[PDB]
Structures are given as structure tokens and as C-alpha cells.
Design an enzyme around this catalytic site. Structure first.
Site, short mmCIF file in Angstrom:
data_model
loop_
_atom_site.label_atom_id
_atom_site.label_comp_id
_atom_site.label_asym_id
_atom_site.label_seq_id
_atom_site.Cartn_x
_atom_site.Cartn_y
_atom_site.Cartn_z
N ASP A 5 0.80 -1.22 0.00
CA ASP A 5 0.00 0.00 0.00
C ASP A 5 0.84 1.27 0.00
O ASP A 5 0.27 2.37 0.02
CB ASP A 5 -0.97 0.01 1.19
CG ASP A 5 -0.26 -0.01 2.53
OD1 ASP A 5 -0.96 0.07 3.56
OD2 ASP A 5 0.98 -0.10 2.57
N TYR A 33 10.57 4.64 1.23
CA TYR A 33 11.58 3.69 1.68
C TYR A 33 12.93 3.91 1.00
O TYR A 33 13.92 3.32 1.45
CB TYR A 33 11.10 2.26 1.44
CG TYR A 33 10.15 1.77 2.51
CD1 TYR A 33 10.63 1.30 3.73
CD2 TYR A 33 8.78 1.78 2.31
CE1 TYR A 33 9.77 0.85 4.71
CE2 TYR A 33 7.91 1.33 3.29
CZ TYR A 33 8.41 0.87 4.49
OH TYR A 33 7.56 0.42 5.46
#
Ligand SMILES: NC(=O)c1ccc[n+]([C@@H]2O[C@H](COP(=O)([O-])OP(=O)(O)OC[C@H]3O[C@@H](n4cnc5c(N)ncnc54)[C@H](O)[C@@H]3O)[C@@H](O)[C@H]2O)c1
Ligand SMILES: O=P(O)(O)OC[C@H]1O[C@H](O)[C@H](O)[C@@H](O)[C@@H]1O
Ligand SMILES: [Mn+2]
Length: 432
Positions: A170, A262
Site C-alpha cells: 500500500d 523507503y
């Protein structure tokens, strides 16, 4: 037509969010039977008793149950929602603490902690799918269970002919949701062009749905002057606000593409490690935060007898599959030319149309050299890790640890790997 659904990991902190979503999207996703499965009967019980109250109030017709028996869970199922955490949050704590105590980033899915979590997930995910296939070979398996990049690679080898397994994340949608708050638009009106691995990607274009104008030039402009917030920034913990806010720095050093949040670990390991508390980690934040609030909620409802975005996306994926919508999602798929200058058997993350016959990936072409070097290094580390799982090879695990960007040293790799082997004694494959 109505559907039978089973949630693997019924004791998860996200499961109550799924039960409330099933009620809201009741008309979008008609269900006849729902089964919560888990290997922890006591952790799943207060969630299941909360569901019985909730369903009685808002979904009387639905037949709901929770169990720790695989036969009851997987028989005659259309969809399997998997959200297990192999080893649970206590082992996530060990992943984060030991890495940080030894001088490297400790994180759930990235670095030494992620690969340790990956080895636990490889064992439990392959064992669980085999059980599922024993009862319902044709059920669509939608997997959230992390670390997604490592799990998808291991499942590619274990089930090469299984065409009804889809791993999703997600994070790409949450970035689109954050962009929609940036631009004061509906997130459903953004058409992205995306490439990379799970928790390691970039948006090369962000097109407006109606007009097709590339909104990415404007996106970087507002980020430089106002910053970058998550769409639900008011409810997010401080660590998530810092992670999303860090994209402003990332977009000034690398202004071409909008990054997956990330990416900050792999491009700024010194800065990210420097600001992480080694003795109170994110796993402790979840234990004191989401886990506590959700389980307390449920126990409030059980005591009284009466009475989002994460759960909705998996349901929307199930809707696009069950009704052959061919709508666009960013999911994890086998490459085989979609990224032209990477190997065929790499599990990559791309925009795809989604119907009854699975994801239909769209070609991206050759990616630039800078991103090719980053992704090939990471996908090689992931493939060496599941090599150690299949071969029972300590040497393969050492090479995977050494090659990884967040470890980057062979002596540090052996030091961390030896520490991981001890605490993961009964949860890892043998490494000889
Ligand atoms: N892919 C994504 O983008 C994404 C996003 C959010 C969460 N997640 C994942 O969802 C999962 C749930 O996270 P959480 O914080 O709720 O963890 P949690 O510990 O609260 O929930 C995990 C549950 O899975 C169960 N479980 C563990 N091993 C199992 C096995 N072998 N078989 C069956 N059940 C098992 C546990 O009993 C536990 O109830 C995590 O793995 C997390 O990584 C993924
Ligand atoms: O750290 P937590 O609150 O458990 O959340 C961590 C989660 O957030 C991200 O958005 C990723 O998409 C998930 O794969 C990850 O597991
Ligand atoms: Mn994810």
C-alpha cells in the site's frame, strides 16, 4: 453471486479495520462467508468476538467465524487475504534492536531486520500456501504479508505454475494519497508511472486523469516550499511524519523522480541510522500504539456487548479481480521484459491492469543507469537470501547480508548474521 473470504492472520492489529471495511463496502463486495484464521487462538479471540458483535449489528446475513483449524478456514474459498507476521511483533523487536545495537539500520523490511523477517516469512508463507492449496486450489490469494519483495521471490520458486497468487503493497497508493493532499485533488484522479522493487521505487510521471498533464513538475514545486505530509498526518506517529517529510530532502538531491519513502534508507543510511533510537524502536511504538489501541477497542466492545485505507485497497483489489474491472494498480509481478535491462525472473513493482486473469503489467523499458545499479544490487541480495532458504546455505546468507546496501560489509554481515541465527533458532531454515 457472493464470495467466501478467509483472512490469514485473524489476530492482526489490522483485522478490525478489515471487518469494518467489509461492512462499508458491503454493496461493492458482496460476501456470503468470512473466516478468520490464525495460529494464535488467544490473540485472535477478542478480535473474533468483536466481529460477531459488529456483524450482528451491521451484517446479520454474513456467516462469520474464527478458527485455528486449516480445514475449516480454507475449504471452498474464493479469496484468501493474508496478513501474517511470522514471529510476530516480539521478533520484529529483535530484528530492529540487534541491528541497531550492532551499528546498522534496524527496520521491519529493509536491511538486516528485513532479511531476518524474510527468512521467517519464507518458512511460514510456503507452509501456509501448501495448506491452502490442499483445500481450495483455485482461490485467489492476495498477500500483504511482509517482507513482500522476499516473499514474492520465494513464492515464485515454490509455486511456478500457480497463477492465482498476488503480492501487493500500500506504499505506492499512500504516496498518491499524500500527493492528492498536496494538490487538493482526489487521489483517484492521478495516473502514475512507476517502477522498482517493493519498498524501493520511483514515480517517473504523475498524470492528471482527465487532462493527462504531468503534475510531477508542480508536485516538486509545492514540496520545496511547503513540504510533504502523509494524507492522514493528524493520526500518524512522529516517526512516520519524519519519514514522509524527508522526501523534501530527497527530491532536492535527486529531483528527477518522486521517490518511494523507503528510498531514504538506501540513499541516506548514515542519516537514517543516526536518528534511530536503538533501545526504543518502531516495534515498541506499534506495541505501545496501534496494537494497544486496537485491542483495547475490541475489549471495550466485548465488555459492553454493543458497539480504513489499508483494508480498503485489498478489498478494491479483490473487486477488480472478481468483476474483471481491468483497473490500474501498482502490484508486484514477475518482470520478464517489463523492465527491459533487468533479469527476467525478478519480482518487480509496476502499474498493472487487474482482472480475473491476474495482473497485466505495462512495459517501462530500460531504466536509467543510476537506478539500475541500485535495484540490481538489491534484487541480487534478495535472491541470494532465498537461495540460503532453499539450499540451507550459511554461505548464501552471508553473501546476501554482505551485498545488501544497509549492511555493506562482510565482517559486519557475519557478526549480524550470527546474532540473527541464535535468536531465530526455531523459526529460520537451517544454515550450514
Ligand atoms: N504489504 C504492505 O504494504 C503492508 C502494509 C501494512 C502491513 N503489512 C503486513 O501485515 C502484517 C500484519 O502486521 P501487524 O502489525 O498487524 O502484525 P501482528 O503481529 O499484529 O499480526 C500478525 C498476526 O499473524 C499471525 N501469524 C503469525 N504467524 C502465522 C502463521 N504462520 N500462520 C498464521 N498466522 C500467523 C499472528 O498470530 C498475528 O495475530 C505484517 O506482516 C505487516 O508486514 C503489509
Ligand atoms: O511500522 P508500521 O506502523 O507497522 O507500518 C509499516 C508498514 O508501512 C508501510 O506503508 C509499508 O507499506 C508496509 O509494508 C509496512 O509494513
Ligand atoms: Mn509495503
Amino acid at each position: 453471486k457472493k464470495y467466501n473470504v478467509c483472512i490469514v492472520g485473524g489476530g492482526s492489529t489490522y483485522t478490525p479495520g478489515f471487518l469494518k471495511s467489509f461492512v462499508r463496502l458491503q454493496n461493492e463486495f458482496p460476501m456470503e462467508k468470512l473466516v478468520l484464521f490464525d495460529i494464535d487462538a488467544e490473540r485472535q479471540q477478542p478480535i473474533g468476538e468483536f466481529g460477531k458483535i459488529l456483524f450482528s449489528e451491521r451484517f446479520p446475513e454474513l456467516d462469520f467465524s474464527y478458527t485455528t483449524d486449516p480445514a475449516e478456514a480454507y475449504k471452498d474459498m474464493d479469496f484468501i487475504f493474508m496478513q501474517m507476521r511470522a514471529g510476530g511483533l516480539p521478533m520484529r523487536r529483535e530484528d530492529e534492536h540487534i541491528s541497531l545495537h550492532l551499528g546498522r539500520i534496524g527496520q521491519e523490511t529493509c536491511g538486516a531486520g528485513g532479511m531476518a523477517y524474510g527468512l521467517r516469512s519464507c518458512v511460514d508463507m510456503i507452509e501456509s500456501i501448501h495448506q491452502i492449496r490442499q483445500y481450495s486450489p483455485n482461490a485467489w490469494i492476495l498477500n500483504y504479508s511482509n517482507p513482500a519483495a522476499i516473499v514474492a521471490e520465494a513464492l515464485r520458486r515454490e509455486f511456478p505454475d500457480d497463477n492465482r497468487i498476488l503480492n501487493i503493497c500500500d506504499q505506492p497508493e499512500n504516496i498518491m494519497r499524500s500527493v492528492s493532499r498536496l494538490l487538493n485533488v482526489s487521489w483517484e484522479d492521478l495516473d502514475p508511472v512507476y517502477f522498482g522493487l517493493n519498498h524501493y521505487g520511483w514515480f517517473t510521471h504523475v498524470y492528471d486523469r482527465k487532462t493527462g498533464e504531468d503534475l510531477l513538475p508542480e508536485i516538486k514545486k509545492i514540496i520545496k516550499e511547503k513540504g510533504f505530509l502523509p494524507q492522514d498526518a493528524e493520526q500518524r506517529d512522529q516517526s512516520w511524519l519524519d519519514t514522509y517529510g524527508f522526501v523534501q530532502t530527497m527530491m532536492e538531491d535527486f529531483p528527477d523522480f518522486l521517490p518511494n519513502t523507503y528510498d531514504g534508507y538506501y540513499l541516506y543510511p548514515d542519516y537514517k541510522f543516526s536518528h534511530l533510537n536503538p533501545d526504543y524502536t518502531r516495534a515498541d511504538e506499534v506495541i505501545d500504539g496501534r496494537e494497544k489501541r486496537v485491542f483495547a477497542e475490541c475489549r471495550e466492545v466485548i465488555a459492553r456487548g454493543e458497539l480504513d485505507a489499508h483494508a480498503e485497497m485489498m478489498i478494491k483489489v479483490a473487486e477488480a479481480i472478481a468483476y474483471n474491472k481491468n483497473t490500474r494498480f501498482i502490484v508486484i509481478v514477475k518482470n520478464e521484459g517489463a523492465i527491459a535491462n533487468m533479469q527476467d525472473d525478478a519480482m518487480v513493482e509496476l502499474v498493472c491492469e487487474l482482472g480475473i486473469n491476474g495482473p497485466r503489467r505495462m512495459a517501462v523499458g530500460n531504466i536509467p543507469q543510476f537506478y539500475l545499479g541500485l535495484l540490481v544490487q538489491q534484487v541480487s541480495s534478495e535472491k541470494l537470501l532465498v537461495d540460503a532458504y532453499y539450499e540451507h546455505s550459511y554461505q548464501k546468507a552471508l553473501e546476501a547480508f554482505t551485498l545488501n546496501r544497509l549492511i555493506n560489509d562482510a565482517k559486519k554481515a557475519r557478526e549480524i548474521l550470527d546474532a540473527m541465527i541464535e535468536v531465530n533458532k526455531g523459526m529460520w531454515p537451517e544454515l550450514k
